[PDB]
Scaffold this active site. Structure first.
Site, PDB file in Angstrom:
ATOM      1  N   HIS A  66      17.783 -42.239 -37.681  1.00 45.51           N
ATOM      2  CA  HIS A  66      18.947 -41.582 -38.322  1.00 45.51           C
ATOM      3  C   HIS A  66      19.618 -40.554 -37.401  1.00 45.51           C
ATOM      4  O   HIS A  66      20.805 -40.284 -37.545  1.00 45.51           O
ATOM      5  CB  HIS A  66      18.535 -40.875 -39.620  1.00 45.51           C
ATOM      6  CG  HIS A  66      17.819 -41.772 -40.579  1.00 45.51           C
ATOM      7  ND1 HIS A  66      18.383 -42.923 -41.087  1.00 45.51           N
ATOM      8  CD2 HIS A  66      16.594 -41.672 -41.139  1.00 45.51           C
ATOM      9  CE1 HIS A  66      17.527 -43.494 -41.924  1.00 45.51           C
ATOM     10  NE2 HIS A  66      16.435 -42.754 -41.961  1.00 45.51           N
ATOM     11  N   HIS A  75      24.356 -34.577 -35.859  1.00 47.41           N
ATOM     12  CA  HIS A  75      25.216 -35.658 -36.319  1.00 47.41           C
ATOM     13  C   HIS A  75      26.381 -35.769 -35.349  1.00 47.41           C
ATOM     14  O   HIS A  75      26.847 -34.751 -34.872  1.00 47.41           O
ATOM     15  CB  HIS A  75      25.734 -35.380 -37.732  1.00 47.41           C
ATOM     16  CG  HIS A  75      24.648 -35.101 -38.714  1.00 47.41           C
ATOM     17  ND1 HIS A  75      24.153 -36.074 -39.551  1.00 47.41           N
ATOM     18  CD2 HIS A  75      23.945 -33.973 -38.985  1.00 47.41           C
ATOM     19  CE1 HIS A  75      23.187 -35.556 -40.301  1.00 47.41           C
ATOM     20  NE2 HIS A  75      23.049 -34.290 -39.973  1.00 47.41           N
ATOM     21  N   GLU A 110      30.039 -33.167 -39.905  1.00 50.39           N
ATOM     22  CA  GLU A 110      29.919 -33.425 -41.334  1.00 50.39           C
ATOM     23  C   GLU A 110      30.831 -32.475 -42.075  1.00 50.39           C
ATOM     24  O   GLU A 110      31.726 -32.915 -42.791  1.00 50.39           O
ATOM     25  CB  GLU A 110      28.448 -33.297 -41.766  1.00 50.39           C
ATOM     26  CG  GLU A 110      27.573 -34.293 -41.031  1.00 50.39           C
ATOM     27  CD  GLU A 110      26.352 -34.705 -41.816  1.00 50.39           C
ATOM     28  OE1 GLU A 110      25.520 -33.828 -42.085  1.00 50.39           O
ATOM     29  OE2 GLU A 110      26.243 -35.905 -42.157  1.00 50.39           O
ATOM     30  N   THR A 123      22.652 -33.621 -46.633  1.00 47.13           N
ATOM     31  CA  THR A 123      23.768 -34.534 -46.351  1.00 47.13           C
ATOM     32  C   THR A 123      23.339 -35.989 -46.124  1.00 47.13           C
ATOM     33  O   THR A 123      24.179 -36.854 -45.896  1.00 47.13           O
ATOM     34  CB  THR A 123      24.590 -34.104 -45.123  1.00 47.13           C
ATOM     35  OG1 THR A 123      23.788 -34.276 -43.959  1.00 47.13           O
ATOM     36  CG2 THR A 123      25.100 -32.638 -45.217  1.00 47.13           C
ATOM     37  N   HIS A 150      22.294 -29.088 -36.963  1.00 45.78           N
ATOM     38  CA  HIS A 150      21.656 -28.570 -38.173  1.00 45.78           C
ATOM     39  C   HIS A 150      20.283 -28.008 -37.849  1.00 45.78           C
ATOM     40  O   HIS A 150      19.406 -28.748 -37.417  1.00 45.78           O
ATOM     41  CB  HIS A 150      21.517 -29.663 -39.225  1.00 45.78           C
ATOM     42  CG  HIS A 150      22.826 -30.046 -39.843  1.00 45.78           C
ATOM     43  ND1 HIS A 150      23.004 -31.209 -40.559  1.00 45.78           N
ATOM     44  CD2 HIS A 150      24.032 -29.434 -39.824  1.00 45.78           C
ATOM     45  CE1 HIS A 150      24.256 -31.285 -40.970  1.00 45.78           C
ATOM     46  NE2 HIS A 150      24.895 -30.216 -40.540  1.00 45.78           N
ATOM     47  N   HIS A 210      18.375 -31.064 -35.790  1.00 50.00           N
ATOM     48  CA  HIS A 210      18.854 -32.392 -35.458  1.00 50.00           C
ATOM     49  C   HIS A 210      20.385 -32.333 -35.390  1.00 50.00           C
ATOM     50  O   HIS A 210      20.981 -31.316 -35.709  1.00 50.00           O
ATOM     51  CB  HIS A 210      18.412 -33.419 -36.512  1.00 50.00           C
ATOM     52  CG  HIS A 210      18.936 -33.119 -37.874  1.00 50.00           C
ATOM     53  ND1 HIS A 210      18.215 -32.405 -38.804  1.00 50.00           N
ATOM     54  CD2 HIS A 210      20.134 -33.389 -38.437  1.00 50.00           C
ATOM     55  CE1 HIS A 210      18.955 -32.224 -39.880  1.00 50.00           C
ATOM     56  NE2 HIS A 210      20.117 -32.796 -39.682  1.00 50.00           N
TER      57      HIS A 210
HETATM   58 ZN   LIG Z   1      21.796 -32.856 -40.892  1.00 48.99          ZN
END
Ligand SMILES: [Zn+2]
Ligand SMILES: [Zn+2]
EC number: 4.2.1.1
Length: 258
Positions: free
Chosen positions: A62, A94, A104, A196, A117, A92
């Site tokens: 992910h 995105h 996000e 999220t 994050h 981590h």
């Molecule tokens: Zn996240």
């Protein structure tokens, strides 16, 4: 064969099995700077990461995550909207398939190239498994990435991504100082929200920093060469692992700054 970011399993489909996806405090959200009001009651925010002990880096299909030893009040976050002590569990990212998307949260509908994050849990609940069942169980510190000059603090991460190319691969990752990923200003917005990703639990106080960090075009490009898939499976490059903004509904985004 479970949720992800593909044509079959991506954010538009998650509501089919996670009905909280259409709930009343979902994340991320757009931060409208005209309606997000300064709150003079917000206490000073304290990021205390000098004692952080990083452990490992992992591609879990992910994102990639760096874990920390949270076994005592090593790295913590206090103040701001938060009561008590929250311990740093992991971070981590995105990111997008191109520089013009990947974050996000958005600001006045602007998407950044990526979003970091830093996930923390509320020590009042004793452990993470209890915390994630409570509305104030987690605090996630969100930091925007824009494309500019290279970020020295990301070098160690970039240098090891080739060793965790596929899902399930991990490496030792010690002595990484997360302060290198923080902007100069700690001015922030805050609101109550959710994870999220699935399970989209409504257990997060979000603290999103106003100042983005700049990373080079090459550095964010390297994130895009990770694989969603495992070794031996056909390649599906890890990009656009972000959820779009969700309705604010009956919430207020508060600014720490005038
Ligand atoms: Zn996240
Ligand atoms: Zn099945």
């Amino acid at each position: 064969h479970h949720w992800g970011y593909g044509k079959h399993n991506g954010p538009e489909h998650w509501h089919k099995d996670f009905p909280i996806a259409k709930g009343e405090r979902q994340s991320p959200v757009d931060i409208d700077t005209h309606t997000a009001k300064y709150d003079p009651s917000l206490k000073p925010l304290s990021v205390s990461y000098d004692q952080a002990t990083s452990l490992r880096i992992l591609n879990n299909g992910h994102s990639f995550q760096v874990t920390f030893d949270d076994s005592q009040d090593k790295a913590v976050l206090k103040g701001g909207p938060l009561d008590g002590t929250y311990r740093l569990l992991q971070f981590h990212f995105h990111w997008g398939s191109l520089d013009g998307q990947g974050s996000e949260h958005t600001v006045d509908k602007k998407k950044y190239a990526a979003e970091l994050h830093l996930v923390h849990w509320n020590t009042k609940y004793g452990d993470v498994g209890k915390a994630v069942q409570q509305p104030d169980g987690l605090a996630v510190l969100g930091i925007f990435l824009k494309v500019g000059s290279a970020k020295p603090g990301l070098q160690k991460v970039v240098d090891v991504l080739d060793s965790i190319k596929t899902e399930g691969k991990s490496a030792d990752f010690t002595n990484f100082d997360p302060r290198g990923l923080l902007p100069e200003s700690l001015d922030y917005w805050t609101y109550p929200g959710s994870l999220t990703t699935p399970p989209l639990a409504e257990c997060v106080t979000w603290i999103v920093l106003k100042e983005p960090i700049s990373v080079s075009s090459e550095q964010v490009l390297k994130f895009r060469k990770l694989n969603f898939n495992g070794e031996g499976e056909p390649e599906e490059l890890m990009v656009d692992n972000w959820r779009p903004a969700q309705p604010l509904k009956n919430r207020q985004i508060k600014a720490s700054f005038k």
